[PDB]
Structures are given as structure tokens and as C-alpha cells.
Amino acid sequence: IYNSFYVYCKGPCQRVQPGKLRVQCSTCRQATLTLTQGPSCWDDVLIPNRMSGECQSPHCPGTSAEFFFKCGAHPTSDKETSVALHLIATNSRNITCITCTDVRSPVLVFQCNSRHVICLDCFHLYCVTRLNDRQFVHDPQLGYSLPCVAGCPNSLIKELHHFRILGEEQYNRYQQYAAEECVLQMGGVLCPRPGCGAGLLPEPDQRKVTCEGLGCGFAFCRECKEAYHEGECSAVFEASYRVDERAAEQARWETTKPCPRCHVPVEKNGGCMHMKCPQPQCRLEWCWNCGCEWNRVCMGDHWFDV
Numbered sequence: 313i314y315n316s317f318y319v320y321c322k323g324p325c326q327r328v329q330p331g332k333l334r335v336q337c338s339t340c341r342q343a344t345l346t347l348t349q350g351p352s353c354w355d356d357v358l359i360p361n362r363m364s365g366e367c368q369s370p371h372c373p374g375t376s377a378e379f380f381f382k383c384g385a386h387p388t389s390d391k392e393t394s395v396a397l398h399l400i401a402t403n404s405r406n407i408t409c410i411t412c413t414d415v416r417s418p419v420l421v422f423q424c425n426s427r428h429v430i431c432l433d434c435f436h437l438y439c440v441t442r443l444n445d446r447q448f449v450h451d452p453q454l455g456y457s458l459p460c461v462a463g464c465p466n467s468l469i470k471e472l473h474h475f476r477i478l479g480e481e482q483y484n485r486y487q488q489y490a491a492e493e494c495v496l497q498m499g500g501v502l503c504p505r506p507g508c509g510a511g512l513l514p515e516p517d518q519r520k521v522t523c524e525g526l527g528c529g530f531a532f533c534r535e536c537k538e539a540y541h542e543g544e545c546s547a548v549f550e551a552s553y554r555v556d557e558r559a560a561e562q563a564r565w566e567t568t569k570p571c572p573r574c575h576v577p578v579e580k581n582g583g584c585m586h587m588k589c590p591q592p593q594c595r596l597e598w599c600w601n602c603g604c605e606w607n608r609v610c611m612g613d614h615w616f617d618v
């Protein structure tokens with residue numbers, strides 16, 4: 313199976329999963345929108361009304377397509393959709409991770425000039441450590457994010473749902489970043505438990521903080537916001553863009569094809585996998601990747617790839 317789409321399934325998976333691409337008529341919201349041409353890039357499927365087609369519904373004048381993704385690891389209800397993480401891709405070229413140098417798949421590809429790749433395990437740890445060490449980067453109109461681990465310019469992540477990889481608890485803290493930052497500069501602490509989130513003012517010398525008007529019954533550590541513990545916090549936290557240059561050089565992500573049936577040269581349209589044979593005696597519609605004739609599986613798994 314060739315998966316070009318990856319989503320974050322909030323439930324029941326609570327992880328990054330291969331996604332199924334779907335389209336419907338934006339007017340009647342039925343799966344009857346036949347595309348004049350297929351999507352060739354992420355903008356085609358993420359930007360409203362980018363693409364046009366024909367609705368096959370009886371009395372619907374619909375022209376515009378509406379794309380959405382669903383987790384493919386299990387049955388999903390009609391409106392059980394998931395957010396697409398376009399920075400994540402199959403590691404078909406077997407690029408090594410910029411941090412651990414392991415060959416993993418899928419990987420996250422930063423938008424930096426070098427297009428450094430990083431495995432999801434390492435990206436998870438990267439986000440977790442920056443979150444705990446309060447080292448997220450503030451962008452005025454976007455919020456809080458992180459650039460490439462190599463600190464490359466113009467690599468700041470714009471689709472903030474990528475930080476869902478923090479895990480559900482840590483992601484909740486990430487959503488409180490501005491508020492917690494204000495409480496911290498004040499010499500205070502923010503209760504880590506989602507249902508509470510009370511602002512607390514502990515003793516400046518005390519490291520244990522009790523959520524005690526009305527708080528909750530939770531004693532936690534001031535430095536790692538975890539349930540209070542003896543001695544040192546996690547070694548990854550008290551350990552505070554130093555990247556191995558050779559590992560970073562390795563970790564970089566770097567037109568027609570004959571019709572499978574009649575072998576006439578067919579032109580590819582951008583990253584779209586849908587190929588349409590021009591030969592009037594053939595006119596095969598086929599997948600650039602699979603070499604088979606076009607079908608719903610190729611549509612859902614890899615309508616396009618970039």
C-alpha cells in the first residue's frame with residue numbers, strides 16, 4: 313500500500329495514521345462530485361473551492377469540491393474526520409533521521425531549505441522538551457510553534473495540529489502556552505490537570521505545588537508539571553540547536569510515462585497520480601504509481617503526492 317496522506321486520529325487511535333482522502337459536493341454534501349481533474353497538491357485539497365467538477369445528484373447545481381480526510385485504521389462514521397498533517401510522508405527514499413540516524417517511516421519533513429527529515433519518535437521528544445523548557449517560538453498571527461531542529465530559517469511549522477504528536481495531556485498544556493507564560497513571568501504556576509487549570513502561587517523556594525478558593529487534589533512538580541516526585545525530574549528535562557552536522561547532511565529530502573496499455577507518452581500533472589491516456593484508441597485512465605487503471609483505492613490512498 314502506498315500512503316501519501318497522514319492524519320492525526322484523535323480517537324480511537326490517538327496517534328498519527330495513514331489517511332483516506334475523500335471528496336464531496338460542497339453544495340449538497342453528497343459523495344457525488346466527479347472531478348474534472350484530480351488534485352495535484354495540498355492547496356487543491358486544503359483551500360476551499362480550489363477545484364471544480366460535476367455533481368451527479370439529481371437536482372444539485374453543485375460545481376465545487378470539498379475535500380476531507382478520515383483515519384483508515386478502522387471504521388469511521390460519516391462525519392468522523394481527521395486533520396491532515398502535510399509535513400508527514402512515507403520514507404520511501406529511506407532518508408535517515410536528523411537526530412537518531414535511524415531509517416524510520418513515516419517521517420516529518422521540515423520546510424527548511426535543506427528539507428531535513430525527522431522520525432516521529434524524535435519529533436515527539438523534540439516538542440516535549442521544548443514545551444517543558446518553555447522554548448517554543450512565538451509568531452504574532454499564528455501562535456506558538458517550532459522550527460527545524462537544526463534551527464534553519466523559514467522552517468517554522470504553520471499547521472499547528474502537527475503538535476498533536478505531543479500526546480493528549482502535553483498538547484492541552486501547549487494550548488495553554490500564552491496563559492502559562494504569563495503566570496510564569498509572574499512567579500506562579502499553572503495546574504497541569506485539564507479539568508482544573510487553576511493558577512497557583514507556590515512558595516518561591518518550594519518545588520512541590522499543591523493545588524489548594526477552590527482547587528483540586530493534585531500535588532505536582534513545579535519544574536516538569538508531572539505528579540510530584542522525589543529528587544530529579546526526567547533526565548531529558550534537566551538537560552538544559554546542537555545537531556550533528558553529518559547526520560543533518562544525510563537527513564535531507566531530495567515529465568511523462570508511457571501508458572501501461574498502449575505505451576504512448578502520457579504527461580503527469582503536478583503531483584497528481586491520475587493519468588489520462590491521450591491515444592483515442594486507448595484512453596486508459598491509470599495511476600502513475602500503481603500502473604493499474606484508475607480506481608477508488610488509488611484515489612483515497614494517493615490521489616496526489618508531493
Ligand SMILES: [Zn+2]
Nearest residue numbers: 321325383385
Ligand atoms: Zn484512527
Ligand SMILES: [Zn+2]
Nearest residue numbers: 337340372374
Ligand atoms: Zn451536489
Ligand SMILES: [Zn+2]
Nearest residue numbers: 409412431434
Ligand atoms: Zn529519529
Ligand SMILES: [Zn+2]
Nearest residue numbers: 424428460464
Ligand atoms: Zn532544517
Ligand SMILES: [Zn+2]
Nearest residue numbers: 503508523528
Ligand atoms: Zn488543580
Ligand SMILES: [Zn+2]
Nearest residue numbers: 533535536545
Ligand atoms: Zn519534576
Ligand SMILES: [Zn+2]
Nearest residue numbers: 571574589594
Ligand atoms: Zn494508452
Ligand SMILES: [Zn+2]
Nearest residue numbers: 599601602610
Ligand atoms: Zn495507485
